[PDB]
């Protein structure tokens, strides 16, 4: 039962077994061969740069980017045979790391045993079609006399090296060509081959600002990601494509109108389900039903397609062995006649296990690997891990968080302020980013510190149309989740099903076209000329000069911008002393009244009696981020009492809804007695819509009004870092000029109080994070929920006057049976609304 991982060096000879001479799909029929290695069952590795559909100039670093975060370019990566052996030995160690945990051992088992359907929507109904490049590749087998031979091989996954971009990893299905259209068998439930362009050395980076839990000794720090977790992330897409459930529609497009908005690629609904967490209700409950019904129609078509098979093209393939494998893969049943049918009860378990089973957050808890909690957390510049083959840095059982080196606790193995021996910075020669300009003095801002806002057209409007109720209308499940522990329990109970010999007949029938590389390169930087001061001029004025020179602070933002030595600040009394030159007095009173000066100007907390949900209000948000109302220069509390929490937004949204169409009843036939099930479906579908729009309003908040709240916390963290770093340099200049006899003894006490600055700046971020998180909860549960509840109380009295008119029409069938007189008092739950659950739906009874 345990999975085996093979070992080889790149210089090992071809054996026509685990080491072959490949022909990748998109090389069908060109006689171009690359060396491949079988890492395990149905998985191969090709140490080559992904160069399909590309130009040699695409691998060069451009001047600026078109969309997304920073990208690193290097044409010389994976070039020599020493780089390919470095790539081969690293991938073996990452697969051993995944194997040594039962969560990763179950993920590999699902991928290996999910072989794709021989055939698709444009194959023949009576035969298995193992004769397209989308299911078969070729290899060349030499004899002792150097005489080659053409053969084929079946496989599920092939891992290459990275493309022009190194720190982005991809996974992809094979497109087909039919009547001049693109077609993916990995999206119709058939499955196909999934190819990887993986790079293990260059990893992304995140921080620790937003999270609720906070430790005063840990503070705020940045972290880098485990490449093993970056690989399992890349196997679930293969699992999704092997089952043919790749999603591609109901994407989300960002907004590209204002300047403070972020330009990125459209977020797909394939990527939000894989990551997991609270960013999974980003898709509304109504789209998840559309995706569920599509796969059900696809698997139903496969069941009928699999029942009419009689033969194949390869004369040696036993036709009975495969039909038991795909009744096992697709969870099919048999009727009394022998045809395969779809058991919906077994389909719901299988569909939830693939889409909402394996996530990166769940796999990170099982592997003790630290992950970000929000898809919208800040991404920094990527780093590289040069010593993955060093067990003192990374082993196949703990990764970077080794316990024998006190690195497992608090994920210090990934902390960049602690484990400095594990990562190195990338040279700026290949690192390319997208910069925006604010001229007013021109400043450049990256494409990662802005704020992601999407569009309104990207969100479903189906929960607004006409839904027709009948007698045979079923219920929506409203259940789209699956526990990872349940997958591990079922995996241990499995019987070892065996795959057949994966050798077949050569390929003769593909087409060797690769989809063209979509470029991201841009020639020029977008330059914005504005009139007024935005939030980024306020943050730029707080930056300290990178020189040991006299510095002062001022309350004028224009003085700090023009003058080099002057810095903008929003703590009035703190500016009183740092400018005062302490002459003739000890640093005891001078320095202490500078440390705890910042203490009681930073952790400021208040409440507003009009706003009951927010328990902590930080007043100095306004003056530090230029969040001010007309006629409120500094009166941040007075502007909050009038406008409300909407003032913190950079971008006010429309909070209304159009119209929620009444339900209609079309089952007029009362030919059979006790047709009252039509009443039950009308009550059940009434309850569903009240959950649909709710989770469709919970969907727009996560994608438009829960990102400007998060970035106020990031912008507050930078300002608090600018203010603290300024004070810590203000105090060093007066210390070098200080010429006192006690100077040598009080040195440790001076540095002891500079660490007190971070301790109070962290306590301030605790109040700020509670501010922005509760204010984000106060703009949902009140306003637009009360604007969801507003005219959803209208569809109710618009569906009783249709129901009771349907009840009054077929009234002569339900009387004198304790049914009609009962179902008029039953209309009390109709006076009761179904409330909202922000987080957990608690039931104390």
């Amino acid at each position, epitope marked *: 039962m345990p999975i085996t991982i093979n070992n080889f060096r790149y210089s090992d000879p071809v054996n026509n077994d685990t080491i072959i001479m490949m022909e990748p799909p998109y090389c069908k029929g060109l006689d171009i061969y690359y060396k491949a290695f079988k890492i395990t069952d149905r998985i191969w590795i090709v140490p080559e740069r992904y160069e399909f559909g590309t130009k040699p100039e695409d691998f060069n670093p451009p001047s600026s980017l078109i969309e997304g975060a920073s990208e690193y370019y290097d044409p010389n990566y994976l070039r020599t045979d020493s780089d390919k052996d470095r790539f081969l030995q690293t991938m073996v160690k990452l697969f051993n790391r995944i194997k040594n945990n039962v969560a990763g051992e179950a993920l590999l088992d699902k991928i290996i045993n999910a072989i794709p359907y021989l055939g698709n929507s444009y194959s023949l109904l009576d035969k298995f079609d193992t004769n397209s490049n989308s299911v078969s590749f070729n290899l060349l087998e030499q004899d002792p006399s150097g005489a080659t031979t053409k053969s084929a091989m079946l496989t599920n996954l092939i891992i290459f090296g990275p493309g022009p971009v190194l720190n982005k990893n991809e996974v992809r299905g094979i497109v087909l060509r039919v009547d001049n259209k693109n077609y993916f068998p990995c999206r119709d439930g058939f499955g196909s081959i999934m190819q990887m362009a993986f790079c293990p050395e260059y990893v992304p980076t995140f921080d620790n600002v937003i999270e609720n839990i906070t430790s005063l000794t840990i503070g705020k720090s940045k972290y880098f990601q485990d490449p093993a977790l970056l690989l399992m992330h890349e196997l679930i897409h293969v699992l999704h494509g092997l089952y043919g459930m790749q999603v591609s529609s109901h994407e989300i497009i960002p907004s590209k109108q204002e300047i403070y908005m972020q330009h990125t690629y459209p977020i797909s609904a394939e990527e939000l389900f894989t990551f997991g967490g609270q960013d999974a209700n980003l898709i509304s409950i109504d789209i998840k039903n559309d995706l569920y019904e599509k796969t059900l129609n696809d698997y139903k078509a496969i069941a009928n397609k699999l029942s009419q098979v009689t033969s194949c093209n390869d004369p040696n393939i036993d036709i009975d062995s495969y039909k038991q494998i795909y009744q096992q893969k697709y969870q099919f049943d048999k009727d009394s006649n022998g045809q395969y049918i779809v058991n919906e009860d077994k389909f719901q378990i299988l569909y939830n296990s693939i889409m909402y089973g394996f996530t990166e957050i769940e796999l990170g808890k099982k592997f003790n690997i630290k992950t970000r909690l929000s898809y919208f957390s800040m991404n920094h510049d990527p780093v590289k891990i040069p010593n993955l083959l060093d067990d003192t840095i990374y082993n196949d059982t703990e990764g970077f968080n080794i316990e024998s080196k006190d690195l497992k606790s608090e994920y210090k193995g990934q902390n960049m302020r602690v484990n400095t021996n594990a990562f190195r910075n990338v040279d700026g020669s290949g690192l390319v980013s997208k910069l925006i300009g604010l001229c007013k003095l021109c400043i450049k801002i990256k494409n990662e510190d802005l704020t992601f806002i999407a569009e309104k057209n990207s969100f479903s409007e189906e929960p607004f149309q006409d839904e027709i109720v009948s007698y045979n209308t079923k219920n929506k499940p409203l259940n789209f989740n699956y526990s990872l522990d349940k997958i591990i329990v079922d995996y241990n109970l499995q019987s070892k099903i065996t795959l057949p010999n994966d050798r077949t007949t050569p390929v003769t029938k593909g087409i060797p076209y690769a989809p063209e590389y979509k470029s991201n390169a841009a020639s020029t930087i977008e330059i914005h000329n504005i009139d007024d001061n935005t939030i980024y001029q306020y943050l730029y004025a707080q930056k300290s000069p990178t020189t040991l020179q006299r510095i002062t602070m001022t*309350n004028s933002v224009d003085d700090a911008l023009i003058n080099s030595t002057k810095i903008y600040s929003y*703590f*009035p*009394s*703190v*500016i*009183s002393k740092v400018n*005062q030159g302490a002459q003739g007095i000890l640093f005891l*009173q001078w320095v202490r*009244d500078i440390i*705890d*000066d*910042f*203490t*009681n*100007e930073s*952790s*400021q*907390k*208040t*409440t507003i009696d009009k706003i009951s949900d927010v328990s902590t209000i930080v*007043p*100095y948000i306004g*003056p530090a981020l230029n969040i001010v109302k007309q*006629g*409120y*220069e*500094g*009166n941040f*509390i*007075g502007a909050l009492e009038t406008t409300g929490v909407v003032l913190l937004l950079e971008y006010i949204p429309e909070i209304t809804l159009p119209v929620i169409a009444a339900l209609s009843i079309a089952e007029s036939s009362t030919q059979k007695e006790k047709i009252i099930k039509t009443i039950d479906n009308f009550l059940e579908k009434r309850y569903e819509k009240w959950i649909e729009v709710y989770k469709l309003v919970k969907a727009k908040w996560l994608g438009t009004v829960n990102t400007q709240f998060q970035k106020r916390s990031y912008q507050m963290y930078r300002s608090l870092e600018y203010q603290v770093d300024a004070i810590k340099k203000i105090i060093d200049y007066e210390y070098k000029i200080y010429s006192g006899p006690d100077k040598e003894q009080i040195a440790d006490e001076i540095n002891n109080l500079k660490n007190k600055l971070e301790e109070k700046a962290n306590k301030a971020m605790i109040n700020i994070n509670i501010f922005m998180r509760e204010s984000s909860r106060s703009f949902l549960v009140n306003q637009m929920i009360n604007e969801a509840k507003k005219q959803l109380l209208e569809f109710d009295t618009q569906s009783k006057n249709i129901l009771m008119q349907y009840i009054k029409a077929n009234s002569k069938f339900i009387g004198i049976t304790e049914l009609k007189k009962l179902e008029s008092k039953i209309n009390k739950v109709f006076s009761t609304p179904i409330p909202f659950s922000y987080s957990k739906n608690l039931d104390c009874w």
Partner: antibody
Amino acid sequence: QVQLMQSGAEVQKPGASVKVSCQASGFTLNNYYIHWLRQAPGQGFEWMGIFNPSSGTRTYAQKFQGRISMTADASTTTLYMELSGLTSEDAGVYFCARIGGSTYGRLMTYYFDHWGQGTVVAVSS
Amino acid sequence: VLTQGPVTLSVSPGGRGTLSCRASRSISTTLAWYQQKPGQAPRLLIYGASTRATGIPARFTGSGSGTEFTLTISSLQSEDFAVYYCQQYNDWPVTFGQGTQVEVKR
């Protein structure tokens, strides 16, 4: 009962020193901003200085900057006002005032509700 | 600076008065009102432009538009003969007005 008492000013000479005190009674002192204020023989109100409950934050008005200092002792429930370099424009009655609502968290910005009774600073030749 | 000019104001007992507090754009914060007699400690009348503490009778209240604020009193008595101050802030400290002495019957 809530009370502040102040003591420690009489009649001085130009350029000497004096030190003044403000002892609370009736609440938890270590949770409130406490100001210093004054009034001259004839002119109106003029804020002079505030310190902050953590023996912490403090500013001064422009007319005494670098010439006066504020600090407190969180263990004897007392705050003080240092005067250094006295001239003929510093006479008047001085008050110490705590800000209110600091029971709901000390770091309230802008408030106050209660002074004591005031002692006379007097300077002359 | 906070202007309370003219520094005096007179009204017969039991009528309606106004004391104004003109500021500037370099203010825009909360404002507090304070009744004051020299043989006594100042009394908090209004805080936060509007909020009135318990113990202040139902006569003291006000408003505050743009860069100006005012104090309003109802039913004047003889005990209201005192000096009144408005107290605001800027980006640095506390700032008081020149103060306004209110005469009543004579």
